Structures are given as C-alpha cells and as structure tokens.
C-alpha cells in the first residue's frame, strides 16, 4: 500500500514519444518480482509535466491492468489549479488504484492558506486516500509541518511524499500528525537517513534500475537493521546521485535501456537525450551497484 | 510595442471566478488613457496558471476586440512541454497580438539545451515575435544569458522578460545579442534600476493602478532622466514591494477593486482572498502613491 | 570526555564586560549537579570573538580550577590565523583540559585543501585531542565531509562538533571514519535527530539553562530510547529556537540572570542588550520547559 | 581620495611569510604611475585576517613612507570586537592614513542595532573618516541600507564598500544619505554596473595587476561614458572573476609574481599556494586582459 520501497516508475516510450505498452509491461513484471512495494504512475519521474490529462489517464490505466492486481498503483494527480486537480482525480474515482499522489502547486506559489484550501478542495472530491507531494525546487512553493498538520486531519489524507531533503522535517511533521500518517522521503540520496528518523519509505527513482536492492534495503530499516540497510545505501548512491547528473528522468531512462528493460529511452521535449558525458557517469554507477 | 511600461494585466473576475468582460472593458480603457506602452494579456499576473487554454484564448480574444487597436496586446503562451506551447501559440496566428510572452517551462527543470531546443522550436513554428520570460522563483529553472545569447540568433526570438532581480543579468545578456534585442524587467521593485543599466522597460503589475506613473517613469528612463524617475519610483516603491505582501495577483486585483477599476477581486483556488492585514498593508501603500 | 549533554557555556561577565567568578563558580557547580558531561569553555557561546587570547586563556584556566576535577573542560583553540590557532592551542598544552574545539577559519574562506592544512598544522604542534568545528553561516567556509575524512586520520583529531544543522552530514562523515570518531551535534534544535541517525551527543546552548533536561535526553537517545527523548525535546523545542530570536549568547545569558544562575546578563559589544520583545519571548520559553 | 579606481593592495610576502618592501615599494611606484585613486592597505586583499595587529601597523606604516605623499592610503582597521577596532584606529591616528576601511564583525553576527553601536562607537573616537565595508558572505553578517542610513548621520562616516554584488543597494543606500556619502563596490565583477547606477568608484582585487584599464574604466564610467567604459571592462572579465578562482588573493599574488612586480606569491596558512589548474585559469585571464 503505502511503506517501504515505492517506484517513481518511468513512462516508457517509443521513438515518437508514446507509450510503450510492451515496455511498461516489461518493467512491471520486474516490480512484481523484485518486491517493490507500490508503483507510482505518472509522478515526476513518469513525465506527468509533458502528458496530456488523456494521455496521463490512459498510461495509469495501463499500468493498473498489467499490474493485475499483483503491485498497488498510486496515480500522480496533481495540477497547479485546484479544478484541474478535482477533474484528474475523478478520472481515477472506481479505477482501481490505491490512492493519489498530488504535488502542491507549482508556479504559481500559492501562500499555506491556499496549500490548505487546495488540498482539502480535492479530498472532498473523492474517496481515495491522498498523498501529498512537497517538493519546492521544482514548484517554487514549500508545505510547511504545520500546514501538514492541519491537512492530515482531512479523514483522506494519509501521508507525506517529502522530497525537500531536509531531514528535519521527519519529526517536525511526525509530532503533528497521527501515528498512521505516513513519511515518504521524495529523495533517493537522503531516504535511508529519512527512514532511520522515522520515516516508512521511498518514492525512489533509484528503485526503477535496483528494484531488488531497494526494496531489501527498505525491508531492512524498518525491521532496525540500518548497519546492514547502510551497506546497501552505500552500493547504491553513486546511482543515487548520478541519476540527477542531468534532470530526471534523462538519466534512469538511459539506464532502463542499457539494462534491457525499456526498448528506447526517448522523453518529450524539453527533456532532451542524455549527453555521453553523462552516458559514461550513469554507467559507472550502474557498475557500482553491480548491474553491469 | 515592446518598450516602457507594459502592463502584465489582472484577467478581472466575477464571482464565480468567470472573466468579468465589463471590468476588463474599463481597464483596458484606463491603459489606452493613461499611456501604458501595451498589455500582456494572460501573464503571470492574469492567472495563466488556473485558466484552461480556452479560457486562456477568449480572454486574449477579448482583451483584442476591446482594445480595438487602440494599444498593442502581447499574450501568455508559455507552457512546460513542447509540444503544448507549439500548439497554445497557433492559437493566436493572425488573432492581432503583437507578440508572444513566453515562460521557461515550470516544474520539469529541463537542461540549458533543452531550453534552447524549447524556444527553438516554438519559435520555429510562428511569425509572432517571442519574447523569453525568465522567473526561476517561480519555475525551479533559470534561463541563463548565454543561452538567451543563442536563442537571441533566431530571427523571431525578440527580446527577455528578466524577472530573477538580479541586475547583473542586464549587461551579461546586452553584450550576447544584437542592439534591437529587447530587455525588459519583471521585476517592478528592481525596474528602474534594470533600465538604468540599459532595459528597454518592465512588464509590469505596479502598472495595473498606477499606470500613469509608470509610463512616465520609463519614459524619463529611456531618455536618460533617471533621477526625474528615481521620484516617482520612490513614490511607487511600497506598491512595487507590497502587491507581492500575499501571493501575486491577490494584492493588486483588490487594489484594482478599491479603486473602483473592476467589479470583484476574485481569483481561482488556490489563489485564496486577500487577509485584513495585506488589506492594510495594500491600502498604506495606495496611499503613498497618491492613488487614493 | 566527548559524548552525551555538553554545555557551550557563557562567559558570565560583570557589568563591566569582565568575567564574574562568582558566577563561573555558580554555573560550573549547576553542570556538576546537573549531570553535564563535559563543558565547552570560551566556545562561541563564551564570546571567543570578543576576548582577547590573554582574556581567553584566563577564562579557560579559571574554569579548570572551579570545575576542581569534577568535570572535563574543552577549551575553544580556534583561530583564523594557523600561526595563531598554534599559538593558542598551546596555551593550553599540560593544562588539565581534556581537548580543544577548534572552528574553521572565519573570515578568510580557505579552500578545502587550506583546512586540511590549517587543523593538520594544528593537530601537529600538541598532543591533546582537537574536535573540529564547522558552522558555515558564521564562517563563510563549510569543512565537507571529505575533507574530515582526510583529517581523521591524524591520530589526535577525534572529532566533529557539525553546526550546519543537515542532518545528511551525520552519515556522510560516519562513513568515512572509524568507528571512535565522534560526531556532535552544534544545532540545538536538530541534535535529538543528530543523534538518532548516530551522532554520539551535542555541544549545547540550551544546556546552560535546561542542563538535567539536556543530560536525561542525551542519556535516553544513547540508549536507544528515542520516543522518550523526544517528549523532554519536545517541552526544550521553544528554548532551541528561542534561545537565537536575538544573536546567541544575548538570550542565553538574559535566560541565565533570570534564572538566577549568573549575576549579570551583560555582554561585549558589538552584542547589545537583550530587548524588551526578546526577554519576552525567551521568559516563554523557559515557562514552556517548566523552568519558571 | 575616495572615489575612482581604489587598490585593495596585496601585502607581498618572502618566503617565510614576512612583508616585503621591496615588492611593496615596486607597486606603489605602478599604482603613483598607472593613475590609481588611492591604495587600501590592509584589506581582505592584504591578508587582514592573518597579519597580527603589529605587523598590520607596520604594513600601513611601510606604505604611507614608500607613498611618500604620492597618493592616499586608507588603513584596513575592522574587527569583530568593538573594543578592538577603536584600539586598532588609534594606531593609525597622526599617522598620514586618509581614512580607514571597517568591515562588519565577522563571525559572531550581531544584530543591526548591534552594527549601529559598534560602528558609531569606532567612529567617535577617532577624527579619520571611516568607510563602512559590507561583505555577508565572509562574515556571515548584513549590514542593510536602514542602518547604513543611521550610520550615514554620524559625521566621520562618510561611505560604504558594498560587496554582496546585490546591485539594488546602490540605490537603497543612496536614498537614505547626503549626495556627498561615497558608494563604492567592493565587488569587481559587478562594480561598472554598480557605478553605473550611481557608485562613486571601486574597491579593487583586479586593480593590483590592471591599474591603468580600471583608473581609465573608473573615470568614463564618473563622466557618464558607460559604452566606452564596458569594453574596457569586457577585456577585464575574465580577471574579475578568475582572480577568484581559489581564495582570494591567491590568484592575484600569483598574477602579480607572474608579471613581475613582487618577488614570490608566498601568503600565509590558511591560505595555499595556487593549484596549475588555477595558475592556467589565472593566465588565460591575464591575456585576454592584454597584460602578458
Ligand atoms: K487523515
Ligand atoms: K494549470
Ligand atoms: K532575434
Ligand atoms: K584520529
Ligand atoms: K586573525
Ligand atoms: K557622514
């Protein structure tokens, strides 16, 4: 449902920039059998900035019908304007999914009355559970603890998707929150630490090319084991910060292809093909966690 | 026009958020009186994030018709993917704008090339002059001047909206591109000072209530005055720093209601009302400006 | 020696601006009672900035001889010169302190290889044990973990009082050390999470005022009991914020004089007496801990 | 002299660290011949931060002998304690100093009330002008125009070396004192924009190896001739920015050593000899100038 290791997963395309069913397949089947915890469609790793609200809806609905009930599906449903978010995620309302992952809006900066205002407009709007997504170098705006605090006393808003990278947040949030409401770091690099604090998972890009690894990984931290999750963490985090080297998703879907398990690693425009400087430092990582 | 004080227009709104055609009438009407060099219509400031793009297009339709040639009218027609901007922009081929204001794409934080490929592209695909709209405030990217220095290369690719405050940005863009490219500021409270160093005007929300005073002052700007503007930019100085008091265009839509300009100070979620305290803070500032 | 509570503690002065042995004396007896692991003598809480070496030096031994074998001092040796970091370590060398806390070159901003060469400088020309200490937005240089990495392998550093308040710095360091390098936390309000990611205790600002409180939390995250640490952060949090509402060590010694600890809240300037909102705030706050 | 093509003079060393006359002697003679307004001796260019108080009189004194009446000198004479920049200030009271140059107390960030004591302090007790000097990230501290305009009142505060390279101060701190208080940019890379918007001259790294292209910049940009100035400082760019490619004055002892007017580039620990990377960096600049 919501804990351990969950994948951002990446929308698989064609050369013409359209998804690629036999693709997406491919890496699903390879969640399932790595353990991974949950998929989420259409985040930011998925490209839900260059998909049309069609294209959006059909992608999770694919993703939801080659799961097959074998993996939870969370669908990406966020919008800067609080309508657009009620008429995506009513596109999901009877889907299939476990829940939404909604970012706070980006661009036009709204002040935490407005983060309040929106993400309450959408709750009511449905009965999914709502995950809500703070995430400010990309949006410009950041959903402080207490705003937080107060959304999470919506009965359908269940957790936090914390991808500011600052660790001080885990506890800031946790004393205001219930004790189901769920942490999820937003940072690959960070997570384990984030975990260690508290929190009971990842939204994890890492998780798309080292499913295995992170899921164990995940297991690990929650059962205490954080010396061995550590040694994992540290394999890992070369991978962790170098599929950043150029803007995400650039670099894990270059990956994806070099590993076999999406036929190209074509994105949409202003995404661009990776540069070979960064082929060579996406490898190595690859290399360092041992898959390659 | 793409020079002195252009005002980034409020899109006035009734009370269920709908386009106000009557207040927009007058507004438009105060421009073309009080000398506002053109409008951009459906900017930041006129909501582009919560307007849908049919929305988005009867809006500039109608800022056009009302105009009725009396002023020119740039529209808003950036978006973060490609291939949604190609398309916003044919919306507008032979509609009568004068040009195009153009944002870097939001959220997605594509590379300086994918910017480049970005502006190339949609570009490409009109005659419409375009002029780069750079705020990373907003966005999470900045369009640094040496890719504005090649974008500045292809011919309809006209001038920069430069709205990061930061002034060196002037003189770094100036020596990458020809003598006709245009600078112009979005930034009101550092606008006389990007002129001074050589900006061509400001695309401005100030402008919304005090467009005589801005006209002037760029107009003493160009002709080498500055202490002559300096005054009036004194006296304007709290508008250009507190209509930013609560998230933007909230201030400035109820200091266009106080005046009397449109009907209501609505705005779409999750833009929210203005408090009592920015109401004071907004009124203070009026005030100083001789505006009430 | 270096773990658990460790109080940063002030420089109580007369109204004159010159330590106050009366209550040195009260303090150091209070640390003693209170269950105080170690006390920071003339660190940045002790105004280092303001006494002059000769000054310092006094203080140091002062606090030695009050302390009387019953708790270990630490005397601040950092010095932006190396040649006088040397000068006044060496004050010090068969004193009865225990280790220097040495802070990276303020001022100067020296590259990395320049604090690798300043505290190997230092660390060669004494036998004791040296804490290196980074607080990057006092300094203007931040010692990366790299950098502590390499300077560990001198036998006498030993470790790391981490002031920056990120918390990724905890592991980060862990990884390149052994396993008896000691992390401390020097941001009140993050140490608790310091220490639970596997730092080994915190040089405190707080402990001057809540010192039982500080050594019991301490205490319990040492042995594993965050939950219960958590509550006695719970009831310190609004003396770790409120304790640098104005420049530390203005509220800390106003705190102290209040609670009848020091006779004297007086200070060198450039820090200036505590204002009315500031004594306000900070009585608040120590009303929250149950200390008033 | 406080206007134009200020030097901050490097202090050239021996090998052993010590001040060498005969390199000093050799540039004040280039900067009598090459038309520099006045030389700043002792500034953060002059290793301020780790001469002793002794030897930093005997440089000020050794400067204004070999000067010989040739042109100004202004004394580095700043401290983080207050007490000991009115000590340092007496030293140079008689001695034939023009004026003296007070940077904010580093490290310890006292409050603004803080810096209005401080500086209105120093300036009581001495009958030399002082020139504020502003420069946040070396001192973690931000002396804001409100304060300067404070300070401005005091008679014998008669400017400001403003180094944030935040361009709006210029015309925040001119609206808040007499048309006779000097602005000066403590910032090469942005002086000429900052002179442009009404700075009097600048406080100069670039100026110890270009002495004639900064006094021939300085004086168009004074007479209001920007274009003729800005080629000049195109050719200067590189400089501005490289010589900071490691700590300054790295580079620039490097440059001057390599030029020919000081016998070695000897500073003192923590500072560190050039890396090549930094002398091939700091060579290409010094071409593009026009100088080797
Ligand atoms: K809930
Ligand atoms: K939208
Ligand atoms: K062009
Ligand atoms: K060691
Ligand atoms: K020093
Ligand atoms: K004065």
Known sequence: ??????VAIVTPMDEK????????????????????????????????????????????????????????????????????????????????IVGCLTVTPYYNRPSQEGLYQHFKAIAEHTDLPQILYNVPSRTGC???????????????????????????????????????????????????????????????????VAARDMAQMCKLAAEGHFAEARVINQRLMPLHNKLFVEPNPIPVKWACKELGLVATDTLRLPMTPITDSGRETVRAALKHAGLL
């Not at 259409?42 to 809806?57: I, K, P, Q, R, S």
Request: aromatic fraction near 4%; glycine fraction near 10%.
């Open 1 to 6: 449902m919501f804990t351990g290791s969950i």
């Open 17 to 96: 920039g359209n998804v690629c069913r036999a693709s997406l397949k491919k890496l699903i089947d390879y969640h399932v059998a790595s353990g991974t915890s949950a998929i989420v469609s259409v985040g930011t790793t998925g490209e839900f900035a260059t998909l049309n609200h069609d294209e959006h809806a059909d992608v999770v609905m694919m993703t939801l019908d080659l799961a097959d009930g074998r993996i939870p599906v969370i669908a990406g449903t966020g919008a800067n304007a609080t309508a657009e978010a009620i008429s995506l995620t009513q596109r999901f309302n009877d889907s299939g």
């Open 142 to 208: 950041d959903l402080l603890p207490e705003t937080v605090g107060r959304l999470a006393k919506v009965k359908n808003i269940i957790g936090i998707k914390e991808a500011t990278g600052n660790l001080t947040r885990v506890n800031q949030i946790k004393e205001l929150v219930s004790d189901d409401f769920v942490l999820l770091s937003g940072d690959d690099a960070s997570a384990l630490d984030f975990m260690q604090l508290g929190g009971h998972g990842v939204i994890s890009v890492t998780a798309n």
